[PDB]
Design a protein around this ligand. Structure first.
Ligand SMILES: Oc1ccccc1CNc1nc2ccccc2[nH]1
Ligand SMILES: Oc1ccccc1CNc1nc2ccccc2[nH]1
Lengths: 156, 39
């Protein structure tokens, strides 16, 4: 299968036609996506199979073929880019200044950009092109707008 | 059986479209990985 670094669509043929259920990042031979996209199930890349390696429902993350490799973090000050890969549409970079999710266990950056559910797993990048987290786990606020956490894993 | 298809390189784009606000929200994260607004 394709092992080249980059952003990929996660598709299924189990619903009507071919449907995009999410997105993920291939880096250092490991595929990274959000748990809610695949529910930890195995994936196909051409004729090759990608088996789950690590996952956590509370973090809402999963890696395939190896351990989670993404370790860059939002600096808390600078604008970032969401590399949105929406269903049926070309990959497009959107620049924004994150907001913050404040929790009892600490603060996390958050991006206030609204895209269809099948965009979940799209990467958020810093100015060096490093992936600082994945888009698609968040909340709906007072005015009806969606705000995603910048969800990042831990490189062991 | 889910399958993956490449959609692009991961790179910062100069002069990309700039949008979105920066809300500061109090939130809670449950054992099922769902966030909720705390008010
Ligand atoms: O993908 C998502 C994006 C946002 C919210 C929820 C989900 C989960 N839905 C889902 N339906 C599927 C059907 C076949 C294979 C994978 C699937 N994932
Ligand atoms: O965005 C949504 C969020 C939640 C539910 C439904 C939609 C559909 N609307 C929509 N807005 C877009 C903006 C850019 C690309 C594709 C888009 N699709």
């Amino acid at each position: 299968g394709e092992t080249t670094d980059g952003v990929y669509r996660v598709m299924t043929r189990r619903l009507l036609g071919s449907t995009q259920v999410g997105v993920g990042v291939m880096q250092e031979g490991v595929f990274h996506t959000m748990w809610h996209v695949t529910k930890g199930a195995a994936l196909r890349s051409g004729e090759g199979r990608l088996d789950p390696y690590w996952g956590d429902v509370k973090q809402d993350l999963v890696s395939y073929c190896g351990p989670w490799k993404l370790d860059a973090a939002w600096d808390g000050l600078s604008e970032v880019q969401l590399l949105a890969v929406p269903p049926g549409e070309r990959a497009k970079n959107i620049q924004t200044l994150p907001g913050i999710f404040k929790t009892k266990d600490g603060d996390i950056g958050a991006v206030a950009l609204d895209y269809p559910a099948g965009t979940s797993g799209s990467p958020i990048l810093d100015k060096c092109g490093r992936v600082i987290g994945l888009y698609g786990n968040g909340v709906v606020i007072k005015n009806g707008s969606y705000v995603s956490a910048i969800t990042q894993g831990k490189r062991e | 059986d889910m399958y993956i298809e490449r959609a692009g390189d991961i790179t910062w784009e100069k002069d990309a479209e700039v949008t979105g606000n920066s809300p500061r929200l109090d939130v809670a994260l449950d054992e099922s990985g769902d966030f909720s607004l705390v008010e």
